């Protein structure tokens, strides 16, 4: 069930919600609903971009990152750098306005520039979180062992 995936993304949203002031201070019920909406639109945004030619950078597949070979070897652990191809952008940011409208149903006083600064970053963190997940699983499935 994809609800399981959206809910898992929602659990993550709740964990990092403290970093975003637009959500960190909401009443419990409202916060839960807002995170549910962000998780639901972010996931749909991820899915669409992955199945749509050109919607994701073809080098990083949405993460906007690449492995720094030298540093990974130096530090004995995976060290990442920006993906040059998309300059770290990874996916289109246009789908976010639909999510903004949905969130305004819950926080009616929220303006777009305020959402942009205090809530949207959480939305984007959830979208890239999905790309990163896919990438890690990819690395795992195709590891020359
Ligand atoms: Br998920
Ligand atoms: Cl937006
Ligand atoms: Zn890229």
PDB file of C-alpha atoms and ligand atoms in Angstrom:
ATOM      1  CA  UNK A   1       0.000   0.000   0.000  1.00  0.00           C
ATOM      2  CA  UNK A   2       1.376   3.434  -0.891  1.00  0.00           C
ATOM      3  CA  UNK A   3      -0.178   4.819   2.295  1.00  0.00           C
ATOM      4  CA  UNK A   4       2.502   2.915   4.153  1.00  0.00           C
ATOM      5  CA  UNK A   5       5.128   4.779   2.140  1.00  0.00           C
ATOM      6  CA  UNK A   6       3.450   8.150   2.676  1.00  0.00           C
ATOM      7  CA  UNK A   7       3.082   7.428   6.403  1.00  0.00           C
ATOM      8  CA  UNK A   8       6.748   6.430   6.654  1.00  0.00           C
ATOM      9  CA  UNK A   9       7.645   9.727   4.997  1.00  0.00           C
ATOM     10  CA  UNK A  10       5.316  11.423   7.467  1.00  0.00           C
ATOM     11  CA  UNK A  11       7.169   9.856  10.438  1.00  0.00           C
ATOM     12  CA  UNK A  12      10.361  11.340   9.017  1.00  0.00           C
ATOM     13  CA  UNK A  13       8.647  14.696   8.586  1.00  0.00           C
ATOM     14  CA  UNK A  14       7.709  14.696  12.264  1.00  0.00           C
ATOM     15  CA  UNK A  15      11.288  13.866  13.343  1.00  0.00           C
ATOM     16  CA  UNK A  16      12.884  16.813  11.531  1.00  0.00           C
ATOM     17  CA  UNK A  17       9.922  19.168  11.974  1.00  0.00           C
ATOM     18  CA  UNK A  18      11.757  21.061  14.712  1.00  0.00           C
ATOM     19  CA  UNK A  19      14.145  22.659  12.209  1.00  0.00           C
ATOM     20  CA  UNK A  20      11.273  24.443  10.432  1.00  0.00           C
ATOM     21  CA  UNK A  21       9.566  27.264  12.350  1.00  0.00           C
ATOM     22  CA  UNK A  22       6.508  27.288  10.136  1.00  0.00           C
ATOM     23  CA  UNK A  23       5.632  23.869  11.536  1.00  0.00           C
ATOM     24  CA  UNK A  24       7.626  23.360  14.744  1.00  0.00           C
ATOM     25  CA  UNK A  25       5.166  25.524  16.725  1.00  0.00           C
ATOM     26  CA  UNK A  26       1.745  24.310  15.533  1.00  0.00           C
ATOM     27  CA  UNK A  27      -0.852  22.700  17.784  1.00  0.00           C
ATOM     28  CA  UNK A  28      -0.639  18.896  17.739  1.00  0.00           C
ATOM     29  CA  UNK A  29      -3.656  18.085  15.555  1.00  0.00           C
ATOM     30  CA  UNK A  30      -2.935  20.817  13.013  1.00  0.00           C
ATOM     31  CA  UNK A  31       0.735  19.858  12.812  1.00  0.00           C
ATOM     32  CA  UNK A  32      -0.152  16.225  12.143  1.00  0.00           C
ATOM     33  CA  UNK A  33      -2.532  17.216   9.357  1.00  0.00           C
ATOM     34  CA  UNK A  34      -0.009  19.587   7.831  1.00  0.00           C
ATOM     35  CA  UNK A  35       2.743  16.968   7.859  1.00  0.00           C
ATOM     36  CA  UNK A  36       0.337  14.457   6.312  1.00  0.00           C
ATOM     37  CA  UNK A  37      -0.348  16.855   3.451  1.00  0.00           C
ATOM     38  CA  UNK A  38       3.318  17.620   2.901  1.00  0.00           C
ATOM     39  CA  UNK A  39       4.141  13.904   2.925  1.00  0.00           C
ATOM     40  CA  UNK A  40       1.300  13.168   0.517  1.00  0.00           C
ATOM     41  CA  UNK A  41       2.225  15.858  -2.038  1.00  0.00           C
ATOM     42  CA  UNK A  42       5.984  15.312  -1.717  1.00  0.00           C
ATOM     43  CA  UNK A  43       5.577  11.596  -2.406  1.00  0.00           C
ATOM     44  CA  UNK A  44       3.339  12.207  -5.416  1.00  0.00           C
ATOM     45  CA  UNK A  45       5.836  14.813  -6.600  1.00  0.00           C
ATOM     46  CA  UNK A  46       8.663  12.241  -6.285  1.00  0.00           C
ATOM     47  CA  UNK A  47       6.747   9.475  -8.100  1.00  0.00           C
ATOM     48  CA  UNK A  48       5.768  11.669 -10.981  1.00  0.00           C
ATOM     49  CA  UNK A  49       9.295  13.003 -11.470  1.00  0.00           C
ATOM     50  CA  UNK A  50      10.844   9.509 -11.416  1.00  0.00           C
ATOM     51  CA  UNK A  51       8.481   8.144 -14.046  1.00  0.00           C
ATOM     52  CA  UNK A  52       8.644  11.246 -16.236  1.00  0.00           C
ATOM     53  CA  UNK A  53      11.428  11.696 -18.822  1.00  0.00           C
ATOM     54  CA  UNK A  54      13.334  14.907 -18.172  1.00  0.00           C
ATOM     55  CA  UNK A  55      11.721  15.611 -14.785  1.00  0.00           C
ATOM     56  CA  UNK A  56      14.859  14.425 -12.927  1.00  0.00           C
ATOM     57  CA  UNK A  57      18.514  15.041 -13.591  1.00  0.00           C
ATOM     58  CA  UNK A  58      19.799  11.964 -15.369  1.00  0.00           C
ATOM     59  CA  UNK A  59      23.038  11.884 -13.419  1.00  0.00           C
ATOM     60  CA  UNK A  60      21.895  12.072  -9.799  1.00  0.00           C
ATOM     61  CA  UNK A  61      18.248  11.012 -10.330  1.00  0.00           C
ATOM     62  CA  UNK A  62      16.940  13.716  -8.021  1.00  0.00           C
ATOM     63  CA  UNK A  63      19.430  13.761  -5.149  1.00  0.00           C
ATOM     64  CA  UNK A  64      21.351  16.664  -6.628  1.00  0.00           C
ATOM     65  CA  UNK A  65      24.468  14.973  -5.243  1.00  0.00           C
ATOM     66  CA  UNK A  66      27.263  12.705  -6.448  1.00  0.00           C
ATOM     67  CA  UNK A  67      30.027  10.743  -4.714  1.00  0.00           C
ATOM     68  CA  UNK A  68      33.317  12.574  -4.214  1.00  0.00           C
ATOM     69  CA  UNK A  69      35.578   9.658  -5.064  1.00  0.00           C
ATOM     70  CA  UNK A  70      38.756  11.109  -3.529  1.00  0.00           C
ATOM     71  CA  UNK A  71      37.247  12.136  -0.210  1.00  0.00           C
ATOM     72  CA  UNK A  72      35.281   8.900   0.117  1.00  0.00           C
ATOM     73  CA  UNK A  73      38.579   7.036  -0.175  1.00  0.00           C
ATOM     74  CA  UNK A  74      40.364   9.491   2.153  1.00  0.00           C
ATOM     75  CA  UNK A  75      37.676   9.418   4.848  1.00  0.00           C
ATOM     76  CA  UNK A  76      36.787   5.730   4.608  1.00  0.00           C
ATOM     77  CA  UNK A  77      33.116   6.633   4.231  1.00  0.00           C
ATOM     78  CA  UNK A  78      30.792   7.980   1.548  1.00  0.00           C
ATOM     79  CA  UNK A  79      31.512  11.638   0.979  1.00  0.00           C
ATOM     80  CA  UNK A  80      29.171  13.535  -1.334  1.00  0.00           C
ATOM     81  CA  UNK A  81      29.550  16.601  -3.526  1.00  0.00           C
ATOM     82  CA  UNK A  82      27.156  18.651  -5.650  1.00  0.00           C
ATOM     83  CA  UNK A  83      25.964  17.126  -8.913  1.00  0.00           C
ATOM     84  CA  UNK A  84      27.392  19.375 -11.591  1.00  0.00           C
ATOM     85  CA  UNK A  85      24.807  18.493 -14.230  1.00  0.00           C
ATOM     86  CA  UNK A  86      21.862  19.938 -12.311  1.00  0.00           C
ATOM     87  CA  UNK A  87      24.029  22.075 -10.044  1.00  0.00           C
ATOM     88  CA  UNK A  88      22.410  20.341  -7.096  1.00  0.00           C
ATOM     89  CA  UNK A  89      18.821  21.070  -8.112  1.00  0.00           C
ATOM     90  CA  UNK A  90      17.786  17.475  -8.893  1.00  0.00           C
ATOM     91  CA  UNK A  91      14.037  17.965  -9.429  1.00  0.00           C
ATOM     92  CA  UNK A  92      11.656  20.709 -10.624  1.00  0.00           C
ATOM     93  CA  UNK A  93      10.223  22.921  -7.873  1.00  0.00           C
ATOM     94  CA  UNK A  94       6.994  23.832  -9.687  1.00  0.00           C
ATOM     95  CA  UNK A  95       4.822  21.059  -8.190  1.00  0.00           C
ATOM     96  CA  UNK A  96       5.145  22.804  -4.798  1.00  0.00           C
ATOM     97  CA  UNK A  97       2.373  25.380  -5.363  1.00  0.00           C
ATOM     98  CA  UNK A  98      -0.292  22.676  -5.280  1.00  0.00           C
ATOM     99  CA  UNK A  99       1.114  21.625  -1.909  1.00  0.00           C
ATOM    100  CA  UNK A 100       1.078  25.260  -0.785  1.00  0.00           C
ATOM    101  CA  UNK A 101      -2.622  25.547  -1.559  1.00  0.00           C
ATOM    102  CA  UNK A 102      -3.362  22.365   0.368  1.00  0.00           C
ATOM    103  CA  UNK A 103      -1.467  23.613   3.406  1.00  0.00           C
ATOM    104  CA  UNK A 104      -3.402  26.902   3.336  1.00  0.00           C
ATOM    105  CA  UNK A 105      -6.583  24.885   3.884  1.00  0.00           C
ATOM    106  CA  UNK A 106      -5.061  24.051   7.272  1.00  0.00           C
ATOM    107  CA  UNK A 107      -3.197  27.336   7.979  1.00  0.00           C
ATOM    108  CA  UNK A 108      -5.441  29.947   6.186  1.00  0.00           C
ATOM    109  CA  UNK A 109      -3.230  32.892   7.150  1.00  0.00           C
ATOM    110  CA  UNK A 110      -0.076  31.498   5.506  1.00  0.00           C
ATOM    111  CA  UNK A 111       1.267  33.687   2.657  1.00  0.00           C
ATOM    112  CA  UNK A 112       3.367  32.172  -0.138  1.00  0.00           C
ATOM    113  CA  UNK A 113       6.605  33.999   0.743  1.00  0.00           C
ATOM    114  CA  UNK A 114       6.243  32.932   4.378  1.00  0.00           C
ATOM    115  CA  UNK A 115       5.514  29.362   3.275  1.00  0.00           C
ATOM    116  CA  UNK A 116       8.553  29.620   1.038  1.00  0.00           C
ATOM    117  CA  UNK A 117      10.778  30.453   4.020  1.00  0.00           C
ATOM    118  CA  UNK A 118       9.219  28.557   6.923  1.00  0.00           C
ATOM    119  CA  UNK A 119       7.440  25.515   5.516  1.00  0.00           C
ATOM    120  CA  UNK A 120       8.491  24.779   1.937  1.00  0.00           C
ATOM    121  CA  UNK A 121      12.006  23.714   3.021  1.00  0.00           C
ATOM    122  CA  UNK A 122      10.404  20.857   4.912  1.00  0.00           C
ATOM    123  CA  UNK A 123       8.427  19.980   1.781  1.00  0.00           C
ATOM    124  CA  UNK A 124      11.607  19.892  -0.301  1.00  0.00           C
ATOM    125  CA  UNK A 125      13.415  17.881   2.371  1.00  0.00           C
ATOM    126  CA  UNK A 126      10.695  15.247   2.043  1.00  0.00           C
ATOM    127  CA  UNK A 127      10.958  15.168  -1.768  1.00  0.00           C
ATOM    128  CA  UNK A 128      14.740  14.770  -1.848  1.00  0.00           C
ATOM    129  CA  UNK A 129      14.450  12.270   0.997  1.00  0.00           C
ATOM    130  CA  UNK A 130      12.594  10.034  -1.472  1.00  0.00           C
ATOM    131  CA  UNK A 131      15.230  10.482  -4.184  1.00  0.00           C
ATOM    132  CA  UNK A 132      17.992   9.711  -1.666  1.00  0.00           C
ATOM    133  CA  UNK A 133      16.147   6.585  -0.523  1.00  0.00           C
ATOM    134  CA  UNK A 134      15.947   5.322  -4.116  1.00  0.00           C
ATOM    135  CA  UNK A 135      19.612   6.116  -4.667  1.00  0.00           C
ATOM    136  CA  UNK A 136      20.771   4.259  -1.549  1.00  0.00           C
ATOM    137  CA  UNK A 137      18.670   1.231  -2.447  1.00  0.00           C
ATOM    138  CA  UNK A 138      20.131   1.457  -5.934  1.00  0.00           C
ATOM    139  CA  UNK A 139      23.676   1.512  -4.604  1.00  0.00           C
ATOM    140  CA  UNK A 140      22.797  -1.497  -2.457  1.00  0.00           C
ATOM    141  CA  UNK A 141      21.181  -3.549  -5.209  1.00  0.00           C
ATOM    142  CA  UNK A 142      24.074  -2.927  -7.603  1.00  0.00           C
ATOM    143  CA  UNK A 143      27.061  -3.022  -5.291  1.00  0.00           C
ATOM    144  CA  UNK A 144      29.998  -4.863  -6.838  1.00  0.00           C
ATOM    145  CA  UNK A 145      30.463  -6.994  -3.706  1.00  0.00           C
TER     146      UNK A 145
HETATM  147 BR1  LIG B   1       8.682   6.053   1.844  1.00  0.00          BR
HETATM  148 CL1  LIG B   2       5.864  27.268  -3.909  1.00  0.00          CL
HETATM  149 ZN1  LIG B   3      21.952  16.172 -10.887  1.00  0.00          ZN
END
